[PDB]
């Protein structure tokens, strides 16, 4: 059920998760007033070689689905794992979220930072 | 295992508002149209025959019409089509001198000028003794006459290759960025919206500089939209949107001659020859019929807001500046004024011909308010005719009873009537969420 | 055999192969004119993230070779192992294929979307 | 300790390396005049894709750290294991390798081109 | 540096009548003709 761009938008997370190659497969694409658009694409490309690295910094690099050994915080806010991904959608979730996100971001890339250097002692 | 552990996303349905740096596109029919460049379209980006839409189920976002930047970027774009149009083009710093002029051969009121000048020739050296013919919002005298402008703004004249036709364009935006659309039937653009789609670029939306009566734009479904920022201040304007087109006429009925003296070396002003059969004046003709049907369709949507039991009337412009006042247009090149006294003279209680409107003209011209210096557009050969489509009205109130009159000025509000239903958002994949798995 | 960039073009696919990372490390490469090569080295680098976002959303990610599990359909020419890697060359080859290669493109990032999901049910 | 930027630049290359992060973090960041920033700000990612593609083509693709199968030469500054990383800087050591960084940097992207061809045979 | 390699066994069709470097070079010289002259002096009074 390929339902298109954004197509599980207000599907469940559960629900919106099997589209993930379909929100990201459209995430890049491929005299004045033709600069409009040169300077417009080159944002488009920033925008993604933000997200790509902050993706390889963590435990991820390879795409769409990733692990993470940082511990789930309860007071971000406290749901169950029935009442999130059964009941609640992307856009509401990143609304309680998106004071924390910030906060979480830095684990994240710190929690790897120590699984690289534990890596090197075992080789 | 019962402790969970964050998970990154990459790739959700997660956007936020913001604005970015919006394109265009338009067809490849319209880039055959070529002549020069007409309007915008150049290295332009031609549109894909594959017109993209997703309606995005259960989904619920907030419009805002009155907020909208599409709106900022649209105005100010048309504003930068101006200049970069007339930066070439031929310019007619020494054509303020004084003209001597007269009336126009008649048998009255007094309309036109046929004014005689000097004017150099190619050569520095010996000057020319040629005569054009100007309308009278085109000079004014000095205690003889001289062109309306002189006493302003330096002058520049429109290239005579460029069409001021307005084509469709399509607004996009870039990577990570997506527009959405609202699909319902019912919405005065402000709220919460149910049928939410999203799309990559907006319908064609041709870009028509109009006053009072709205031209060659979308119509409107099921019922007339009534659609307002404040209803209970008077200070802002009313824009409708109509279900039905009204059919409106326009001719210059005037055989006009171009005349073409060389002002060189290389530039050349192109004027006004002699008139080519009868002494008329430009006319636009709405059918009594439609007008009629049209009026009553939009109070019963007044009623609405207005009181059930309410008398709704409407009269002419207040007054202040010309633009306000009259139905400013383009169409065939020219630009005409023109006067609706006629369409806004009625009284609404609780419950076969033409109307004529009379239009003046103008050459010199000074756009959206104060942008793009003066233009004075060429003179145009022939009898001018072009029908167009009222697809709205831009009406104001006054400060028992209401009553309505048209209204204009800022050339922001023409581009909200198409963008109404269009917004703007950012992409954000990374979303994180808790799950029982561990690395 | 250093041969060099696009060295091995005539070269069976078979001996093409050899030279993948001379063909790719010479494929990103580190007033008026002077913007000839500006909106062409743009036009340089969203060719490059144009192609490493398909090894990205495909079962590749590190580059160069890579496997994929789509078994491949008789009706892309029916040749053999013998047939293709041993007796034609990467030009003559996409030239039967270039009907087919977007019926492809799809099933490899689909294939690899199915992946991932039951990646994370088994951990 | 979270140093900065740059922060271990004195410490010894062990001292630096639990930094590495906090370098690679801050390397990418996210009418004329306004194009100062524009050919700037494009000469800032083709500086990251060039690295990135060195990092690529090696046996590293994921990030901060990884190793080789290339044998370390003698003749490249004969120093001990306590010698560079208990007693020496990043900036004081590449100054003696400065000369052999490009000698180097060929072969890892060729003894792993050797190690691709090898892993499609075994499988 | 000049680099340069031989593609041994391959045979491709050129076509010197439809070739675009020609377009591209022929609309360079052309702009480069008029970018050396915006900025010199324009001889409008010397048509006496
Ligand atoms: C709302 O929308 C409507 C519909 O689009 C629009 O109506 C349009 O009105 C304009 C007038 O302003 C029309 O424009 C002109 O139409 C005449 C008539 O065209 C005839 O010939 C064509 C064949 O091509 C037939 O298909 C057609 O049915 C007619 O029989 C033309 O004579 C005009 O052509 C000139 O202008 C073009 C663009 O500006 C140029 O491309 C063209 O070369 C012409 O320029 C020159 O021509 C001569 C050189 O050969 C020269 O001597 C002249 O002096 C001039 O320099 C032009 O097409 C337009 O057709 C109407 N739309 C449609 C679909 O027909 C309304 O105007 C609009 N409302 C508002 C407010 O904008
Ligand atoms: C705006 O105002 C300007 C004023 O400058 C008008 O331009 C003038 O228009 C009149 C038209 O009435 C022109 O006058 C006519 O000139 C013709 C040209 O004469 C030529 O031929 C003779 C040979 O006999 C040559 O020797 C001479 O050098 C010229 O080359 C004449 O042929 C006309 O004569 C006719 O009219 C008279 C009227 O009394 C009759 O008695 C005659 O029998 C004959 O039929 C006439 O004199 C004048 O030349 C124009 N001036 C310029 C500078 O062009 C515009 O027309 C006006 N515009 C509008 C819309 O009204
Ligand atoms: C040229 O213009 C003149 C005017 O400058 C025209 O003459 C005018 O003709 C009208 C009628 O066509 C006269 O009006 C009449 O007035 C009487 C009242 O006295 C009224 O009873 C009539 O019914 C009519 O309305 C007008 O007085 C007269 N003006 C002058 C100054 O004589 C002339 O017809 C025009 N001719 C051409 C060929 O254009
Ligand atoms: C165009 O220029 C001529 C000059 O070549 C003007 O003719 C002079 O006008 C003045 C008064 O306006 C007279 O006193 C002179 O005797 C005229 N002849 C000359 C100077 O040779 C003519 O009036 C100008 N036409 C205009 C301004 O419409
Ligand atoms: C330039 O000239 C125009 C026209 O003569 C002037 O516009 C007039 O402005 C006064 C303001 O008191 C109005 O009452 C008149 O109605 C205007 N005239 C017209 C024809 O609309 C304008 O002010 C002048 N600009 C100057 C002298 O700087
Ligand atoms: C535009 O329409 C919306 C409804 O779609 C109007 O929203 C209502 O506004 C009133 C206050 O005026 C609230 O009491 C209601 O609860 C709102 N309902 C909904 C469904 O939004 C809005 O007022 C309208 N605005 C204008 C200017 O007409
Ligand atoms: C003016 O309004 C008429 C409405 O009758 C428009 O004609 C319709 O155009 C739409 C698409 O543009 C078609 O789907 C309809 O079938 C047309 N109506 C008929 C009766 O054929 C016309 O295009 C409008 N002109 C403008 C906006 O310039
Ligand atoms: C307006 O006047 C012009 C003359 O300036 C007319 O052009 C003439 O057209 C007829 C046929 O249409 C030709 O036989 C003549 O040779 C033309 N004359 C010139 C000088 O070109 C034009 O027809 C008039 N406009 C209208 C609508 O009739
Ligand atoms: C505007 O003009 C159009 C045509 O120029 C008129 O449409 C014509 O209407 C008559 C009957 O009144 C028909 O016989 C014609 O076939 C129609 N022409 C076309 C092209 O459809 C229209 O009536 C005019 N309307 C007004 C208000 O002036
Ligand atoms: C609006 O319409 C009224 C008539 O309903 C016009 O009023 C006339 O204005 C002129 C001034 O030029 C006066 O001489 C008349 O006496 C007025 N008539 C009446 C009945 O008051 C008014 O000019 C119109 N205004 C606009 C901007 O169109
Ligand atoms: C617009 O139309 C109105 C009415 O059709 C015109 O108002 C007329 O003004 C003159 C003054 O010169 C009066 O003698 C008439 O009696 C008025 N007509 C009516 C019906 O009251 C007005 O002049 C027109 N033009 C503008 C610019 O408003
Ligand atoms: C507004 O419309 C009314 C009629 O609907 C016009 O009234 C005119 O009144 C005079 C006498 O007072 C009559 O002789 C006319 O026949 C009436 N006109 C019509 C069309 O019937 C009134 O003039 C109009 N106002 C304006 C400004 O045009
Ligand atoms: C979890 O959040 C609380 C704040 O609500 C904070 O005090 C606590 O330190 C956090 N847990 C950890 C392990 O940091
Ligand atoms: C996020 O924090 C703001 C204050 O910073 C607070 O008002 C809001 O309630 C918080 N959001 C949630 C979902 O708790
Ligand atoms: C032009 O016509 C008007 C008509 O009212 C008249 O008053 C004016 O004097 C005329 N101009 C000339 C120069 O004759
Ligand atoms: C609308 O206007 C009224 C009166 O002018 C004002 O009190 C109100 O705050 C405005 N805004 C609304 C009703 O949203
Ligand atoms: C048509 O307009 C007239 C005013 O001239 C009005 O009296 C009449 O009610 C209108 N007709 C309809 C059917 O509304
Ligand atoms: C106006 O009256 C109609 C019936 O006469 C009624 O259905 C409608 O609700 C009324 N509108 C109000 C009271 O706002
Ligand atoms: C293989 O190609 C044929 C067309 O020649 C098609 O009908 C068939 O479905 C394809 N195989 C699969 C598994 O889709
Ligand atoms: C590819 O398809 C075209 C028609 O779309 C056909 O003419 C051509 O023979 C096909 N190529 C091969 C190698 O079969
Ligand atoms: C190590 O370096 C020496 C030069 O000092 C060189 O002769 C030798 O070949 C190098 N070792 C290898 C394995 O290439
Ligand atoms: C690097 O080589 C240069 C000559 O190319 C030499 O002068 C210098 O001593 C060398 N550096 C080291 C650290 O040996």
Same mark, same amino acid.
């Not at chain 2, 959206?368 to 210096?373: A, E």
């Given at each position: 059920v390929f339902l298109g761009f954004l197509g599980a938008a207000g599907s469940t997370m559960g629900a919106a998760s099997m589209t993930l190659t379909v929100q990201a497969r459209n995430l890049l694409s491929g005299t004045v007033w033709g600069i409009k658009q040169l300077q417009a694409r080159v944002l488009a490309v920033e925008r993604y070689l933000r997200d790509q690295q902050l993706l390889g910094i963590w435990?991820?690099?390879?795409?769409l689905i990733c692990c993470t050994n940082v511990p789930w915080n309860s007071?971000?806010?406290?749901?169950?794992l029935s009442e999130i991904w059964?009941?609640?959608?992307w856009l509401q979730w990143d609304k309680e979220i998106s004071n924390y996100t910030q906060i979480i971001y830095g684990l994240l890339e710190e929690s790897q930072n120590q699984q690289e250097k534990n890596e090197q002692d075992l080789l | 295992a019962e402790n969970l552990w964050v998970t990154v996303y990459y790739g959700v349905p997660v956007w936020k508002d913001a604005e970015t740096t919006l394109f265009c596109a338009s067809d490849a029919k319209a880039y055959e149209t070529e002549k020069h460049n007409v309007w915008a379209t150049h290295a332009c980006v031609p549109t894909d025959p594959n017109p993209q839409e997703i309606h995005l189920e259960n989904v619920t976002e907030e419009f805002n019409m009155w907020k909208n930047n599409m709106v900022e970027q649209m105005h100010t774009d048309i504003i930068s089509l101006w200049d970069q149009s007339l930066k070439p083009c031929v310019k007619l710093?020494?054509?303020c001198v004084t003209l001597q002029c007269t009336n126009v051969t008649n048998n009255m009121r007094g309309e036109m000028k046929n004014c005689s000048f000097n004017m150099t020739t190619e050569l520095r050296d010996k000057k020319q003794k040629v005569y054009s013919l100007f309308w009278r919002l085109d000079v004014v005298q000095i205690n003889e006459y001289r062109l309306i402008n002189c006493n302003t703004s330096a002058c520049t004249q429109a290239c005579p290759?460029?069409?001021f036709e307005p084509i469709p364009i399509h607004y996009c935006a870039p990577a990570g960025f997506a527009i959405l659309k609202c699909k319902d039937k019912?919405? @005065?653009?402000?709220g919460p919206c149910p049928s939410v789609s999203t799309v990559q670029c907006t319908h064609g939306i041709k870009p028509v500089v109009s006053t009072q009566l709205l031209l060659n734009g979308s119509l409107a479904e099921e019922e007339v939209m009534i659609r307002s920022? @404040?209803?209970? @201040?008077?200070?802002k304007n009313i824009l409708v949107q109509f279900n039905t087109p009204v059919q409106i006429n326009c001719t210059r009925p005037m055989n006009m001659t171009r005349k073409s003296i060389r002002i060189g070396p290389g530039q050349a002003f192109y004027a006004l020859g002699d008139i080519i059969g009868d002494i008329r004046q430009a006319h636009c003709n709405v059918s009594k019929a439609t007008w009629n049907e049209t009026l009553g369709k939009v109070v019963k949507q007044l009623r609405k807001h207005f009181g059930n039991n309410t008398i709704i009337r409407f009269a002419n412009s207040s007054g202040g500046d010309l633009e306000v006042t009259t139905h400013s247009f383009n169409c065939g090149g020219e630009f005409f004024y023109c006067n609706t006294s006629g369409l806004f003279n009625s009284t609404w209680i609780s419950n076969n011909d033409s109307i004529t409107l009379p239009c003046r003209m103008k050459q010199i011209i000074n756009m959206?308010?104060?942008?793009?210096?003066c233009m004075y557009a060429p003179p145009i050969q022939g009898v001018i005719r072009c029908v167009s489509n009222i697809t709205g009205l831009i009406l104001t109130r006054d400060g028992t009873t209401e009553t309505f009159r048209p209204g204009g000025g800022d050339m922001r509000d023409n581009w909200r009537s198409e963008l109404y239903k269009y917004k703007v958002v950012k992409i954000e994949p990374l979303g994180v969420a808790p799950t029982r798995c561990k690395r």
């Open positions: 435990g991820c690099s390879g795409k007071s971000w806010s406290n749901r169950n059964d009941n609640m959608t | 710093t020494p054509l290759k460029v069409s019912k919405f @005065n653009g402000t920022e @404040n209803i209970t @201040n008077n200070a959206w308010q104060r942008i793009g210096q």
